Symmetry: D3
Subunit: 155 residues, 6 copies
């Protein structure tokens, strides 16, 4: 009965995120994507959840749920104590390590880091939005659904 | 007579800070903890509260004193006849920026900066992260002086 | 026919920037300093002021010109028939973020980014730190071109 | 049927290693500690395996096996495709990332990184040996069994 | 007339190297790939083999030539009337050491070093790691020029 | 009564080292430069040569003395009744390894390690790189004290 939580705002979910979801889903019996409620972003929580659900339909053991407050509480309240977090090029890994040690200290939750695929290693939700805002083509970097939804917000 | 200044907002002081204070006090004749007054820096504790929390925490350090300060750190340092800063390193420290500031501070005022890593036990606490965790009911009592922890629960009530 | 773009907000240009300009001008047939402007946040200097300070300190570089822009850097670059960015590295540079943007810029527009470390003497100055230090009286005169220093003091007073 | 491999020379196994073993054993159904054969070290492969087995006796789902050649082959030949690797203070993380991306590329094996506990974050097999060699006390940093075995090699 | 030197042992040349070669050739009038002769550096391919593998790989780059070299890189560079080095960055690059060498090379000879990150697809290959993986039957054919891969299987037989 | 140890192999001492010595001597009552020797590998200079080169370039520091040692640095430090190490940081420093050793040294012996960034001008010299560059004719005269430079050339010839 293994399980891990993949946390983020996912505003919107990128292929970097999806790659890590897929790896977590492949290595743990159960995966929960934890979507932060914290309203200043582009998509509402429902939209962000929809985009992830749309993009992970072939992952039967993954579910998507919103959450707020301490991540470790989100994880523990679901009977788990593992976080799986992706690494990309602009990741502040020092801060990730700090949070990982804090999360272990206060709640006994482990954090496993996995580098996303090289092809998806330079996209981030923020940079994708920024580039798309100014007409740049990020279609190769987002789930096809997300990409269309993004164009909708901009136009 | 040797001396160094340990700078920060300390909002609140953590055991990470205290560990470095203790090491500074052990290695310099005089240590001044310089507590930032910053009207436009958002914070939880007043300067007087922050100073008092540090004084409680450093009661066993007779050669360390706590003072408020504003503006250029190197002026604070040089005004007190010193020319050394002792700053802690923790997990999540922006060390590249620390280096930049250290080189800037040496250039503009001749002040040296000595960095000390805090003990592993206290390496992942920060003032900001302690506040955030405590705000949502997380137990950071092992990472803060007892008196600080008590005051923190007080501000959150 | 070779060429590169040297981007930044240059608010104000520093000697660290000028070092990088000089190296780009020495290695590419033409160099365009791209003064990138956020239309939704005024900096300390207006665009015309930023450009004037850069021109005055680059007058000895015949193959360098200065233009402002906004939006995607790669559009600025490609619209000038170029395909290269030269970006300086200094102490405190967020290199991981620079790498991320370089890989993104190559992906969306085929533009290459060349990084060069600025000279040690100028390696700890940044526009932001120079402004912050000068704000509180610190002497940054040796880290800025003459075209900048007193104009900076002027803005602050 | 989840599983991961924890690889190393483990010469000798430290509490930093053990902490990560325990986390991997807690989060995966099956864990294999892969002990490299590559003879220039202090302990023989049998001794290194013994020390790990001794230190992990309360981990029923962990086993210890020697291996050589490509790690991904070791992992795949056991029906797995996950590596769990620890991070400590002196870890060359850039090289770890390079190897992780290479291992994913050539064999579809994921690497999950987990930071060892702060208390065990500055011990390494090499530094423990070096310090102990010169009379320094590393007993708080090694399994009690290992520590005694180390003193035996030195004296 | 602009120019840069791309230095390495290239034992063997990888698609990471080639990507950077291509970008250099696109941005400078002349590029020289400088192939290290190093009697005490253990290696798999002879200098002539390494040069030939690079030439095969760069056949479409008319302004790039491949030459062997020994000793101080900056002398190699300056002897050919150039004063720029273009070096790739990959995952596992010791960038702090690269920076040190770049600053040293600028100091002793006035030679600039421009760094370019190789494409993400080729960011995790290195000459050493390719050899090690191939030695144990791992497939690195997607990471090497075809001719290189063929020669590599040949050396391992 | 305050004091610190400045450790290294100093083979040879560089101006980067001397910078750190001067800063330690200015901030601690006494400083001991610890010339740490590996009895199982001769460097370029014998212990007496290393010490002589350091003494000649530190003659203006009355509170600094120079001694050799081997084995655990913390034993060298504690045997002199001290509890502090001052270690320089430069470009190319393996800081993670320094941090690891600092935490280990605190753990086994209660000794504190203070890090200080050496001056930008001396930030890219290292004993090893200076030796390598000088080996192939590169001019490192501005990065080494006079007590070293020609003795270095002597060893190489
Ligand atoms: C799977 C994956 C994650 N990341 C990092 C994304 C990230 O941290 N976004 S974030 O805005 O900062 C963030 C972090 C933690 C949070 O904790 C909670 C979440 C829900 C409820 C309460 C707390 C919330 C938001 C990735 C990067 C690349 C490839 C894959 C991945
Ligand atoms: C573990 C540890 C981390 N730090 C860093 C703390 C820090 O930087 N806080 S800060 O908010 O950003 C900051 C920095 C510099 C300042 O300079 C002045 C101070 C007073 C008057 C004028 C200027 C002010 C605030 C420590 C420092 C000392 C011992 C231990 C540690
Ligand atoms: C669980 C854990 C691992 N490490 C890192 C230890 C390490 O890499 N040792 S190593 O000598 O370099 C090494 C690496 C990979 C290898 O791959 C193979 C192994 C067996 C057969 C074929 C290949 C072999 C040796 C840790 C650090 C701290 C806390 C916990 C951990
Ligand atoms: C992806 C990528 C990585 N690198 C680094 C390759 C590298 O450093 N190899 S190295 O063995 O260590 C090396 C370095 C410098 C040298 O200088 C001389 C060369 C010739 C004659 C005298 C000196 C020699 C060897 C690249 C470089 C160019 C384009 C792309 C990339």
């Amino acid at each position: 009965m293994t399980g891990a939580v993949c946390p983020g705002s996912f505003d919107p979910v990128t292929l970097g995120h999806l790659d890590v979801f897929e790896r977590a889903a492949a290595q743990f019996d159960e995966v929960i994507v934890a979507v932060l409620i914290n309203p200043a972003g582009m998509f509402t929580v429902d939209e962000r959840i929809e985009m992830i659900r749309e993009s992970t339909a072939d992952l039967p053991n993954l579910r998507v749920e919103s959450g707020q407050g301490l991540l470790v509480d989100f994880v523990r309240e679901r009977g788990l104590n593992a976080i799986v977090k992706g690494l990309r090029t602009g990741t502040d890994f020092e801060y990730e390590l700090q949070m990982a040690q804090m999360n272990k200290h206060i709640a006994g939750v482990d954090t496993f880091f996995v580098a996303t695929a090289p092809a998806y290693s330079f996209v981030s939700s923020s940079l994708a939005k920024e580039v798309a805002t100014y007409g740049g083509d990020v279609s190769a970097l987002l789930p096809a659904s997300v990409h269309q939804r993004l164009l909708g917000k901009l136009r």
